[PDB]
Amino acid sequence: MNVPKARLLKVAELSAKIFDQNFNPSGIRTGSKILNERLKGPSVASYYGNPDILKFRHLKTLYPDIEFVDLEEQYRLSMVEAKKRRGKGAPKKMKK
């Protein structure tokens, strides 16, 4: 490095001025890397899916004419009924 240091520094400063990028000659912790990091929140939030998705409830709202049957729900209800019948139903919940 026969070329002088001060001149190189000046050149670097000029380049920094030209572009938006900052010029930190001292090499101090400015905190630039904290803010400059792209925020990843929306992608993280979108992990499990789109919460507004069509459900069986809606398939009654959209098409009242068609008497649909949710099979799993019906099965569950039948199981509950069977439990009630044979004395294995859920105990009544405490309120206090």
Partner 1 sequence: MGNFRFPIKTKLPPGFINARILRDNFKRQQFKENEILVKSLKFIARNMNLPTKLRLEAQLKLNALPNYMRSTQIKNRCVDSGHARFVLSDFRLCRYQFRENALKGNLPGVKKGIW
Partner RNA sequence: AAACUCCAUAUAUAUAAUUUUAAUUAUAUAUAAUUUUAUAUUAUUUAAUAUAAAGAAAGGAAUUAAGACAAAUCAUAAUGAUCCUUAUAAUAUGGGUAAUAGACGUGCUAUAAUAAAAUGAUAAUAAAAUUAUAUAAAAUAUAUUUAAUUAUAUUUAAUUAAUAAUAUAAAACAUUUUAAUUUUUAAUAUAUUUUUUUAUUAUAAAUAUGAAUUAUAAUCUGAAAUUCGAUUAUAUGAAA
Residues forming contacts to RNA in the complex (CB under 7 A) are 1, 5, 8, 16, 19, 21-22, 24-25, 27-30, 32-33, 36-38, 40, 43-44, 47, 79, 82-83, 86, 88, 90-91, 93-96
24: partner contacted, choices partner 1, RNA, none (Cβ within 5-8 A by kind): RNA
Longest CA span, the chain: 96
Which residues, 6+ apart, have CB-to-CB distance to 43 below 8 Å?
Answer: none
**3-11, 46-54, 65-73, 82-90 -> range binding partner 1 (CB under 8 A):** 46-54
69: partner contacted, choices partner 1, RNA, none (Cβ within 5-8 A by kind): none
Q: What is the rounded CA–CA span in Å between residue 24 and residue 16?
A: 9
Nearest to 54 by CA among 63, 43, 45: 63
